[PDB]
Design a protein around this nucleic acid. Structure first.
Ligand SMILES: [Mg+2]
Ligand SMILES: [Zn+2]
Ligand SMILES: [Zn+2]
Ligand SMILES: [Zn+2]
Lengths: 549, 174, 105, 84, 93, 171, 98, 268
RNA sequence: UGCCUGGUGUCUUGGGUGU
């Protein structure tokens, strides 16, 4: 309900289909063509149209709306642009696979070196998994070193000898045994040659090789048009009050576009092959390092400060990468952290919460006819008096802040509204200590608001948490819904976790001076007078009011 | 908003020329293809409706709903007023006016005979349902006129077009 | 394998319930061969690409999935976690419908 | 097709703890959204407590759909599942 | 709310709490996907109430999803590297 | 052209309506939300057959929002014009740029460039009309026109007709 | 401008010693020039030419301004240092050790 | 490795692909928290002690049930059908002893974690119904035999009438049925525990209900629980042992640090 | 009648705290 209304139906993802992007699709989904290396028009606001900061790509400024969708910064997802490459270049992530495919097929007729006549080849084709199918087909066709123009009847081959391909950085060398020993020639396999060879692969051969005709076509592994991500992917940062800093991806895209312009200019004017080779190799290097800057066997691309460029591949790997650092585990709202202390006078499933933390955190309670009076009282009390409230949320989703409202007493609550009231007693909250070695390290307690600034625990629960009070800190997470509150109170509650499934024995017991005192108190020669017995009996909450003889 | 029983239709690479709507070429698109599926997934044919059949069905359904809403206890204006929604009321009023002012067959038995003639005929066993609906709707009088109005019937020269037209004119109430 | 694992665990007098080690050694030997608990053992399964890439070798797995046009059916728990959906686990292992028959009372 | 007939239902006849928790949460949310209550409320005001009271009396108007691994499912009414 | 806490929440079996922690109490986002191409290329204009996928040239078969903003960023970064992750709301077998 | 189609609708119900009369209420909600609407994919939905005996099935509770989602399948009468189709019409307005006709719920605009030249627009005539020696087409006059193009809008359809070929014009 | 209060600043944009400060209060007032907009159309000199770059006190801290130092850096520009003082009394949760 | 493993509604343990890891969780379908160390009484002891404890003879007077513990001791001696029933019970007990002693537990260990604590149930029944005093029981032997026999068929782990389902259900409760028959023998019930009728139906109902309560719940994410339960001890801990040996095991190293054999020689 | 403000870099590195 926090999102503006959209008439499109709301559904959930059921399948993720992977594949490569065809140049046709890249051109189709694009909204603008990027050609001018200058980021800024004239350093007078209004970034140059057709440049790397075109307003059609999306908006990252509060007062500027996207020129493509018309939505604000909070709603615009960003729109892609495309950059046409003067000469096709290798995709750095697919070079070994490109080499394998070149080994599997003939470089002239564009057909497989083996056919279903071979029983082993038919057996390999019979398998289902594309990766294992390709592995088997490569293991077979690797040995076959000559194309056959005749059946081993014409099989469709051209009879040419198949070259042997070797990898060297981003370049592939193909060595032909041209016609005992003679002079063989090894010549460079340019990306364009491989591309126009791959375009002639039949769909049946493509399927036999493990590629998919609809989604992953082999010639799409060579980049001919580059997609330019929106500024949302590469946001700029204001280093100081005046000068903002371009992102690493923006600088790399500027370098790539400059190289493209250089190649285009050189091609039309005059063509010394040495210069063409140098400039095209520079373009290949820039495109490769834009997506992977840890290519072993060659120096990395460096910034002007000397630090290596943060390629897109580096964004996704490691503890701090996308998957581990932002998707599997992320920072969350509605949480608190402070030092823990012990309280002998707390029930097992109770946690003592400071007043300031109780005021800061909140729980949105729906206004009904069972609690409208109490919620109106909370709204009147305001965000500084306990019990109180912080916000009132209407049905449409608008939030009314009670700090900046001059007419808080002039607010009437309608059924279905939400009041973000303060944290109160007996609210279930999840409580956690790191490292979370087992599932008893996260348990749900009941809130009890107390003075002073430390979380307070019954000392029996210090065993499952592996916690003591010499400076440890623990995390508290507040559920924000009725469903989540029910889950916490019915599944993770402390009483339900007393017996562990690891060794079918309790994880909580009497500990420390309570254990010492129950040993001392139950000795055979410990006798208690009447007046002390009365006090000791009154202390038991469950005592039934009958004193034993 | 409303979704057809036909789903999927994911991305491919081939592009076909039988995708654009065209009445003359009898290319009605995927959602109006000759083969359809019901709620049980069984085979189903495209169901066209002539103005006579459409008028009969709409009148029957509207009067059934009007009778049901009154506890099971004829005027087109009242029948339109039965429905809910001002825009819906206007739309049904316009459709009823069109059907009434161009109703070739206002009788159930005349429409039944016309449908029997246009379906059970040996020549009409190949006729597309859209062609049948157009023939029963436009009320053409001549073979040349029908062919000009309906280009599809030009390629179907195995049809007793003139005598069928005369039969329709006879069945048409003067 | 179970005997060796139990020998390692119980040397210092610790006790772990049988069913946990049984599950572990049934996972390690379910394919007909010993499946090591490493990337070379786990990532060489037929599980979804999104689930496999979340453990190790993320970018290489994603390229291999793209080139091979892998299809992920989003049945795992990691896939549903990273897409912000109700995982098919625990309280999400079923569906709740509305009983129009009972509401007639 | 995918639905399993009531006579051939082979899953457990008891309400598992996950099903109990989810049912209580959903019913509490629905009550908090002004759904009709099918039991008499003495002095209770907490939606979760009203949901628990409804569950104890077998008055929750919800159906559990248990998904088998092959895709077929069994529909169990919360009034016919045994609760501890 | 790191990975070990996520594993503890899985062990407890509380799927709703995990979904709420990772979506509502964090980066929740709404996107539109084409029902044909499966890409997040729909140019949606909510105020004018018109949705349109230029590549597939459709205006109807369009759905909206609630996904973490980090997931949207990951898919866009994948598209920046010529990898196309297509999200579909129905299974095919 | 009119057709019979099997359509489906997704209906979301708020928990406040979880009563014994849930099914009938869903039925009237479907009728109010489908009758008379205009979808570009299908055209115009005019009526729903068997409107009081539509199966609604079992609604699924949306996790986290409480509301139930119902899948309603029904059979309805749908009208949709097609490119290159000749249909009857009634002229609704006469203007120098052309005349507007009505084909059921659809309003069709025919420009002068698609009208035969002999049908010169006469503004002095009462009412003004596009008339020839033997033809006079004014407001309320039956016309037979061929639909050439259809324009798709959010919830509206715009069609363009022509009378420049044979067996067209006034009828 | 910052959401704090600027009423504790002196004429020179520096707070004076002996003044009690709370969280988010502004202890150093600094502005940076900005190219003026077309507001000179009809604004009676009340058009924004400068942008705020003030230094607020830390949100969780409060105390007494103890000593304010004003001098020039190596480059000849103004340069200030403000020292804040508070007393911390032991309470539940403070760490001690033998 | 173990995250996507979950107990499904048919009892099997499957991963996300649907592949079966186990056909029944823990090979008995129970929850890890609902088991306790119990002694199976038919395993230990000499043959004479076993015979003395479990055999009942209705022909010899001094080898029969004591007359002061049962009201109907007069019309018991000399009955042949009741002796047939007792002989069937004793043969079942001997078969259980052989199965446990020769197949399952060869080394004779009889203290194993099993569901529903029987000793606690019996002493609860004794406290509830005041089973003290020298009063004679009114519990006939056929009631004991038929009640225990019927109870051993209501411990449902798997529902269904399929023959393979019935075979799996019978397999899943073999050890527990052996425990129950070891405890609820005729002689032990009439003499050692001195239960009356009402205590007997109470014990049977309680056993059935507790067993139903001790099963595993579909939707358990048992893979994560197992991974945590194995990794938790490792944080608090001539042959290789400890973390290096665990690392060798998990990696499936080809060349371990200290390879060894345990060659056993022939009896002579 | 003179009428009230929410908006906060990034990247490295170091030293620490609880297990
Ligand atoms: Mg400590
Ligand atoms: Zn935009
Ligand atoms: Zn060749
Ligand atoms: Zn699309």
């Amino acid at each position: 309900s926090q999102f503006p209304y959209s008439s499109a139906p709301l559904r959930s993802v059921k399948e993720v289909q992977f594949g490569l992007l065809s140049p046709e699709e890249i051109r189709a989904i694009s909204v603008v063509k990027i050609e001018y290396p200058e980021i800024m028009d004239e350093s007078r606001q209004r970034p140059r149209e057709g440049g790397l900061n075109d307003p059609k790509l999306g908006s990252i400024d509060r007062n500027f709306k996207c020129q493509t969708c018309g939505e604000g910064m909070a709603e615009c997802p960003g729109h892609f642009g495309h950059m046409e490459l003067a000469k096709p270049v290798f995709h750095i992530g697919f070079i070994p696979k490109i080499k394998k495919v070149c080994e599997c097929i003939c470089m002239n007729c564009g057909k497989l070196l083996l056919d279903e006549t071979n029983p082993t080849m038919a057996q390999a084709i019979r398998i289902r998994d594309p990766k294992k199918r390709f592995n088997a087909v490569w293991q077979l066709c690797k040995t076959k070193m000559v194309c056959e123009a005749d059946a081993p009847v014409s099989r469709g081959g051209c009879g040419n000898t198949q070259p042997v391909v070797r990898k060297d950085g981003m370049k592939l060398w193909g060595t032909w045994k041209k016609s005992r020993d003679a002079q063989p020639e090894r010549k460079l396999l340019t990306p364009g040659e491989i591309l126009n060879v791959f375009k002639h692969i039949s769909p049946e051969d493509c399927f036999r090789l493990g590629f998919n005709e609809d989604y992953a076509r082999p010639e799409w592994m060579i980049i001919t048009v580059l997609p330019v991500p929106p500024p949302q992917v590469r946001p700029s940062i204001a280093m100081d009050e005046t000068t903002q800093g371009q992102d690493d991806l923006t600088h790399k895209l500027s370098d790539i576009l400059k190289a493209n312009i250089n190649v285009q200019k050189l091609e039309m004017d005059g063509s010394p092959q040495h210069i063409i080779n140098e400039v095209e190799q520079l373009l290949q290097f820039h495109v490769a390092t834009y997506m992977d800057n840890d290519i072993a066997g060659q120096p990395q691309a460096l910034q002007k400060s000397g630090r290596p460029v943060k390629a897109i591949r580096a964004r996704l790997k490691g503890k701090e990468g996308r998957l581990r650092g932002n998707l599997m585990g992320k920072r969350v709202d509605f949480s608190a952290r402070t030092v823990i202390s012990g309280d002998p006078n707390l029930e097992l499933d109770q946690v003592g919460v400071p007043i300031s933390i109780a005021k800061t955190l909140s729980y949105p309670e729906t206004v009904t006819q069972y609690n409208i009076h109490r919620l109106t009282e909370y709204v009147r009390n305001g965000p500084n008096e306990h019990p109180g409230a912080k916000y009132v949320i209407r049905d449409n989703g608008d939030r009314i802040d009670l700090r900046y409202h001059k007419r808080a007493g002039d607010i009437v609550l309608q059924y279905g509204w939400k009041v973000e009231r303060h944290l109160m007693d007996d609210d279930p909250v999840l409580f956690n200590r790191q490292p979370s070695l087992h599932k008893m390290s996260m348990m749900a307690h009941r809130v009890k608001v107390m003075p002073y600034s430390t979380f307070r625990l019954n000392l029996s629960v210090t065993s499952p948490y592996n916690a003591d009070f010499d400076g440890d800190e623990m995390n508290l997470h507040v559920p924000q819904s009725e469903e989540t509150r029910a889950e916490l109170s019915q599944l993770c509650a402390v009483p339900l976790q007393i017996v562990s499934p690891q060794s079918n024995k309790p994880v909580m017991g009497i500990v420390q001076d309570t254990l010492c005192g129950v040993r001392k108190m139950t000795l055979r020669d410990t006798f208690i007078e009447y007046e002390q017995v009365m006090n000791m009996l009154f202390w038991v909450p469950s005592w039934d009011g009958v004193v034993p003889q | 908003v409303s979704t057809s029983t036909v789903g999927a239709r994911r991305r491919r690479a081939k592009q076909q020329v039988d995708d654009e709507e065209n009445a003359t070429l009898l290319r009605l698109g995927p959602e109006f293809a000759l083969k359809q599926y019901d709620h049980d997934g069984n085979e189903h044919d495209l169901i066209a409706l002539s103005l006579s059949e459409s008028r009969l069905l709409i009148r029957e359904a509207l009067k059934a709903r009007s009778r049901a809403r009154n506890g099971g206890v004829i005027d087109d204006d009242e029948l339109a007023k039965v429905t809910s929604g001002a825009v819906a009321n206007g739309v049904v009023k316009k459709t009823l006016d069109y059907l009434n002012t161009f109703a070739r067959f206002k009788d159930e038995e005349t429409c039944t005979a016309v449908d029997q003639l246009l379906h059970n005929s040996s020549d009409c066993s190949v006729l597309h349902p859209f062609e049948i609906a157009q023939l029963s709707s436009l009320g053409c009088e001549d073979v040349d006129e029908a062919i000009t109005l309906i280009p599809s019937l030009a390629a179907k020269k195995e049809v007793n077009l003139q005598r069928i037209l005369d039969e329709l004119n006879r069945l048409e109430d003067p | 394998l179970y005997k060796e694992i139990l020998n390692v665990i119980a040397f210092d007098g610790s006790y772990v319930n049988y069913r946990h080690m049984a599950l572990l050694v049934d996972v390690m030997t379910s394919r007909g061969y010993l499946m090591a608990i490493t990337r070379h053992g786990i990532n060489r399964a037929d599980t979804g690409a999104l689930m496999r890439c979340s453990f190790e070798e993320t970018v290489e797995i994603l390229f291999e999935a793209g080139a091979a046009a892998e299809l992920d059916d989003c049945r795992g728990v990691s896939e549903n976690v990273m897409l912000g959906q109700l995982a098919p686990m625990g309280t999400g292992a079923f569906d709740v419908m509305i009983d129009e028959k009972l509401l007639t009372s | 097709e995918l639905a399993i007939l009531k006579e051939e239902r082979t899953t457990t006849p008891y309400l598992t703890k996950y099903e109990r928790a989810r049912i209580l949460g959903t019913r509490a949310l629905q009550i908090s959204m002004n759904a009709p209550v099918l039991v008499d409320i003495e002095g209770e005001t907490d939606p979760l407590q009203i949901a628990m009271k409804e569950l104890s009396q077998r008055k929750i108007p919800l159906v559990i759909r248990r998904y088998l691994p092959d895709g077929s499912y069994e529909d169990w009414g919360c009034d016919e599942l045994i609760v501890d | 709310f790191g990975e070990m806490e996520r594993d503890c929440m899985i062990a407890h079996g509380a799927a709703g709490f995990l979904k709420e922690r990772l979506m509502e109490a964090s980066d929740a986002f709404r996107v539109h996907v084409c029902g044909i191409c499966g890409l997040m290329s729909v140019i949606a204009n909510l105020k004018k109430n018109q949705f349109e996928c230029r590549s597939c040239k459709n205006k109807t078969n369009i759905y909206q999803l609630h996904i973490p903003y980090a997931a949207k960023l990951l898919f866009q970064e994948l598209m920046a590297m010529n990898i196309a992750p297509r999200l579909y709301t129905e299974r095919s077998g | 052209m009119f057709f019979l189609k099997d359509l489906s609708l997704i209906l979301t119900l708020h928990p406040s309506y979880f009563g014994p009369q849930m099914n009938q209420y869903l039925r009237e909600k479907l009728l109010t939300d489908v009758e008379g609407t205009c979808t570009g994919q299908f055209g115009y939905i005019v009526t729903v057959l068997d409107g009081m005996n539509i199966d609604v099935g079992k609604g699924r509770i949306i996790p986290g929002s409480g509301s139930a989602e119902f899948e309603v399948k029904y059979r309805a009468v749908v009208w949709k014009p097609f490119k290159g189709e000749v249909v009857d019409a009634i002229v609704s307005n006469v203007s120098p740029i052309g005349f507007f006709a009505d084909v059921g719920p659809l309003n069709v605009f025919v420009s002068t460039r698609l009208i035969p030249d002999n049908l010169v627009y006469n503004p002095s005539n009462s009412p003004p009309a596009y008339m020839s020696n033997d033809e006079l087409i004014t407001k309320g006059s039956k016309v037979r026109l061929k639909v050439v193009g259809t324009r798709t809008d959010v919830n509206e359809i715009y069609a363009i007709g022509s009378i420049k070929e044979d067996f067209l014009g006034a009828i | 401008l910052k959401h704090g209060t600027y009423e504790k600043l002196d004429e020179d944009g520096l707070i004076a010693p002996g003044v009690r400060v709370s969280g988010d209060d502004i202890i150093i007032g600094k502005t940076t020039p900005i190219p003026p907009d077309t507001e000179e159309l009809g604004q009676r000199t009340k058009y924004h030419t400068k942008r705020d770059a003030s230094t607020p006190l830390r949100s969780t801290e409060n105390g007494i301004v103890d000593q304010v130092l004003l001098t020039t850096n190596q480059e000849g520009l103004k340069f200030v240092k403000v020292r804040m003082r508070t007393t911390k009394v032991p309470q539940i949760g403070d760490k001690f050790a033998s | 490795a173990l995250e996507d493993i979950m107990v499904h509604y048919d009892g099997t343990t499957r991963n996300s692909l649907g592949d079966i890891i186990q056909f029944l969780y823990g090979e008995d379908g129970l929850d890890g928290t609902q088991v306790e160390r119990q002694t199976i009484d038919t395993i230990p002891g000499s043959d004479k002690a076993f015979h003395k404890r479990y055999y009942v003879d209705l022909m010899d007077e001094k080898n029969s049930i004591k007359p002061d513990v049962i009201e109907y001791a007069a019309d018991i001696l000399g009955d042949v059908e009741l002796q047939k029933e007792l002989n069937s019970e004793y043969e079942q007990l001997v078969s259980d002893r052989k199965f446990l002693r020769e197949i399952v537990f060869v080394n004779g260990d009889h203290n194993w974690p099993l569901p529903v604590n029987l000793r606690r149930i019996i002493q609860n029944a004794q406290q509830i119904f005041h089973l003290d005093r020298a009063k004679a029981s009114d519990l006939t032997i056929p009631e004991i035999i038929h009640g225990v026999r019927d109870l051993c068929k209501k411990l449902f782990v798997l529902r269904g009438e399929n023959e393979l389902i019935k075979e799996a259900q019978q397999n899943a409760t073999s050890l527990f049925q052996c425990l129950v028959r070891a405890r609820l023998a005729t002689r032990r019930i009439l003499e050692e525990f001195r239960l009356n009728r009402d205590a007997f139906e109470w014990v049977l109902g309680t056993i059935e209900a507790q067993f139903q309560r001790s099963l595993v719940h579909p939707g358990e994410m048992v893979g994560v629980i197992a991974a945590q339960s194995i990794g938790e001890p490792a944080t608090q801990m001539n042959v290789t042992l400890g973390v290096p040996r665990l690392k060798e095991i998990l990696n499936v190293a080809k060349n371990i640090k200290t390879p060894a054999l345990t060659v056993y020689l022939d009896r002579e």
